[PDB]
């Protein structure tokens, strides 16, 4: 009874999950939070958290590795999946990790320095602790590689693209891809003749247009800072406005980077929280700035959804996903009501249902475009890739 | 037989036009190009250009004023219109110029330092040379003031908006407004129950959604640098990408401002020209980068048009205007073909017709949304405001 180990080495943590090959179910999950700080701890399944403070990326994975042998499943690890933040132009699909792949991930690392080097540290450790175990790299960018130059080029001088690699990459590709495949079954659509809009909505949020099974447009750009307004990220912002602010407050681009990336978005406008459940209740309690933060959030989602719809020959479905998209009855309705121009009629009974109802259609019959909620499963998609690649001869 | 004098004091020039009150026709037009430089000249109607080199804003208008008396129409100037680049939150409509208005334009001048101070210099001169002549201020921003907070707020921290005035303003308001009023007659629409998308396309380009006679969304932001890719302007650009470029090339935000504002857009990608007629022929001659510049330009127009459509209850018409929108048979078709998702069928015979055919519908019958070309007339709209305000008692 083989299992697959899914690893995600973020900026400050190592999120892991153990999935059964037979059913793709989660048998174990956890997080090694507080990395590179004098308070590193390992919490599993929401139970008693072990410590091993200020431990490196290699030792933190080694701590989990010992917990796997403690529960007699080290001998059952057949495959290991690694989520990679950035795959540049070099990666269009998931690959088996080899020396070549490590070099290539290290080559595109300058495009996302914080996150990619953490991923490489995660690869390095897992290769040490599991030598005879096949390992797979899954990229957040690879799904958006089917984008045409018109869709990925910026208005900047050509030199920046050809000589520096400045272009749209887009993120949440694994989520967007997974949700898409699932949407073809739920909506009984032909993949080869389909047009979908996927709204991945969480703390990090992006829109993606999927024409005929391929990504044709996505809201995030070279960085996760473009497109939708998010939890702490501002989203689309006038560069002329940013230059003006710099002249007035005396702040530099590095200073404004932190403001835009960590102090903006839902957190920025409301001045309360990045969390929606907080702001939904805050507005319910008559908070003015919380209502405006949500209404702006909703507005910019509808603008991009409808914008991304232009990259389709025909619009068949709009799919909501992510912590917000799966659980927010309000935001979904507000966004859909904001898209009456496309002729969406919402079934509020169906939209009222909590995430426990899983994959579900939330639009009425008279609606021209089908609306649905599909819970994303990035771990499952990484596992499914590893299972597929486990049959390959290298 | 009264006339109206329309003045536009740009960054480097003074564009003027004399319009007849009876028919709103142009009787005289010209430009005082090369302002504040040792080569200032005054060219009228495309005839012999006078000089008066390195002349100030007051003297350059005084040079035109002498040419008006030379053609016996100084005694006929009943009204004078001034185009103002930025009206902040203070101006929602066109006003008669008084001491109060001058103070207020000077108050919002920090929002557009280059252009507003030139406008104030233009007001100052015209007040000197024409003391008993009523003068009107027409703002590029005033039409977009009907925008809701959700549509004009950025994702930035709240403090930047409330304490510094950082918000979307949008431009080409006079064009967008004029084209809208004209679109209600051509499309036989009820203004109080209508939804239009106006694509003002020139060297400076912007989209505007007009719901029920009011602007509800527009592509440009606090500055003319947001939204569509343009002639020399990049348009929408990832701020995370701009910060990354700064770290790599060692350039500052002030340096990148010039790159984004003057070296980007159609000029940036193609590396040839900002002019479309050049690039259309360049692509016809098999130039690769020119084709990509146009295809990107087209792509970003369709993305914003469809994006702005979300701010409408119903989409009735899409209206093309500006040097590009009025004259480009190719770009119009490419953009419309890129919006098949909204069900636009193009009549290519009607789209083939040159601008001489003026206001014209270019979409077929089976098309769900009407497409039309309406030549903008900013001077005429400024005159129509002045005529209206000429009846007022002050
Ligand atoms: N029952 C829930 C759970 C989550 N949320 C909201 O969903 C957001 C978090 O989404 P999530 O996908 O879990 O974010 P991440 O885990 O960080 O992943 P990502 O940001 O990439 O989407 C929060 O704002 C939270 O308010 C919600 O509305 N109701
Ligand atoms: N017969 C013509 C004339 C103009 N153009 C194009 O239209 C653009 C200029 O548009 P215009 O509205 O005249 O620009 P401006 O006068 O500067 O005003 P704005 O930029 O604000 O629109 C140029 O790229 C030019 O190639 C065109 O396609 N065919």
The domains located in chain B, with CATH, are 1-188 (3.30.420.40), 189-394 (3.30.420.40)
The set of residues, in sequence order, having a beta carbon less than 8 Å from that of A284 and lying 6+ positions away, is none
Buried b (16+ CB within 10 A) or exposed e, A239-262: bbbbbbbbeeeebebeebbebbbe
Query: What's the token pair of residue A155?
Result: 């208005």
The set of residues, in sequence order, having a beta carbon less than 8 Å from that of A4 and lying 6+ positions away, is A18, A19, A21, A77, A78, A79, A80, A81, A382, A383, A386, A387
The set of residues, in sequence order, having a beta carbon less than 8 Å from that of B286 and lying 6+ positions away, is none
> Which of these, B387, B376, B379, B375, lies nearest to B28 by C-alpha position?
B379
Q: Is A230 on the interface with B (CB under 8 A)?
A: yes
Q: How many CB atoms lie within 10 A of CB B354?
A: 10
Nearest CA to ligand 2 atom 17: B203
CA A222 – CA A210 distance, rounded (Å):
19
B239-249 and A239-249 helices, crossing angle to 10°: 60
Question: Which residues of chain B form beta strands (DSSP E)?
Answer: 3-9, 14-20, 26-31, 43-44, 77-84, 95-96, 134-139, 195-200, 206-211, 214-218, 317-321, 360-361, 370-373
Q: How many CB atoms lie within 10 A of CB A362?
A: 25
The set of residues, in sequence order, having a beta carbon less than 8 Å from that of A159 and lying 6+ positions away, is none
Q: Which residues of B touch A314 (CB under 8 A)?
A: 340-341
Does the beta-carbon distance from A156 to B237 stay under 8 Å? Answer: yes
Which of the residues of A are catalytic?
A: 140
Q: How many CB atoms lie within 10 A of CB A23?
A: 8
Q: Which residues of B touch A224 (CB under 8 A)?
A: 240
Query: What's the token pair of residue A387?
Result: 């299972």
CA A11 – CA A174 distance, rounded (Å):
19
CA A80 – CA A127 distance, rounded (Å):
9
Q: Which of B168, B238, B318 to mutate to test the interface with A (most CBs of A within 10 A)?
A: B238
B29 SS3 class: strand
Instruction: Name the closest residue on chain A to residue B234, using Cα atoms.
Output: A155
**Which of B 293-352 lie inside 8 A of A, CB atoms?**
295-296, 298-300, 302-315, 338-341
Ligand 2 binding pocket mutation candidate from B175, B224, B301, B324 (most atoms within 8 A of CB): B324
CA A381 – CA A23 distance, rounded (Å):
13
Q: Find out whether B362 and B347 touch, Cβ atoms under 8 Å.
A: yes
The set of residues, in sequence order, having a beta carbon less than 8 Å from that of A250 and lying 6+ positions away, is none
- Look at the block and give the residue holding tokens 């933190």: A60
Query: What's the token pair of residue A190?
Result: 């032909």
Q: Is A343 left (phi over 0), alpha (psi -120 to 50) or beta?
A: left
Parallel/antiparallel/unpaired status of strands B370-373 and B317-321 = parallel
């Amino acid at each position: 009874f083989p299992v697959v180990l899914v690893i995600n080495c973020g900026s400050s943590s190592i999120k892991f999950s153990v999935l059964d090959v037979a059913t793709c179910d989660v048998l174990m999950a956890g997080i090694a939070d507080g990395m590179n700080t004098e308070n590193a701890f390992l919490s599993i399944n929401g139970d008693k958290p072990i410590n091993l403070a200020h431990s490196n990326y290699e030792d933190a994975l080694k701590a989990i590795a010992f917990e796997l042998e403690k529960r007699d499943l080290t001998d059952s690890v057949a495959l290991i999946g690694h989520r990679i933040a950035h795959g540049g132009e070099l990666f269009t699909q998931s690959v088996i990790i080899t020396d070549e792949i490590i070099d290539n991930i290290r080559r595109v690392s300058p495009l996302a320095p914080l996150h990619n080097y953490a991923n490489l540290s995660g690869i390095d450790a897992a290769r040490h602790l599991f030598p005879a175990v096949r390992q797979v790299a899954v990229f957040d960018t690879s799904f958006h590689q089917t984008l045409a130059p018109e869709a990925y080029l910026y208005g900047l001088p050509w030199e920046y693209f050809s000589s520096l690699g400045v272009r749209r990459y887009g993120f949440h590709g694994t989520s967007h891809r997974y949700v898409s495949r699932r949407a073809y079954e739920l909506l009984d659509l032909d993949e080869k003749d389909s047009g979908l809009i996927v709204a991945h909505l969480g703390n990090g949020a992006s829109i993606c247009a999927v024409r005929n099974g391929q990504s044709v447009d996505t809201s995030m750009g070279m960085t996760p800072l473009e497109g939708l307004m998010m939890g702490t990220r501002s989203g689309d912002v006038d560069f002329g406005a940013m230059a003006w602010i710099a002249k007035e407050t005396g702040q530099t681009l590095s200073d404004l980077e932190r403001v835009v990336n960590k102090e903006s978005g839902l957190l920025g406008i409301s001045g309360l929280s990045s969390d929606l459940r907080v702001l939904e209740k805050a507005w319910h309690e008559g908070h003015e700035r919380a209502r405006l933060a949500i209404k702006t959030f909703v507005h910019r989602i509808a603008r991009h959804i409808a914008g991304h719809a232009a990259s389709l020959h025909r619009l068949d479905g709009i799919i909501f996903t992510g912590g917000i998209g799966e659980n927010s009855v309000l935001i979904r309705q507000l966004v859909i009501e904001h898209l009456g121009v496309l002729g969406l009629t919402l079934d509020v009974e169906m939209n009222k249902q909590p995430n426990s109802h899983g994959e579900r259609i939330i639009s009425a019959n008279p609606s021209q475009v089908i609306c649905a909620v599909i819970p994303t499963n990035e771990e499952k998609m990484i596992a499914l890739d590893a299972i597929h690649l486990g049959n390959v001869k290298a």
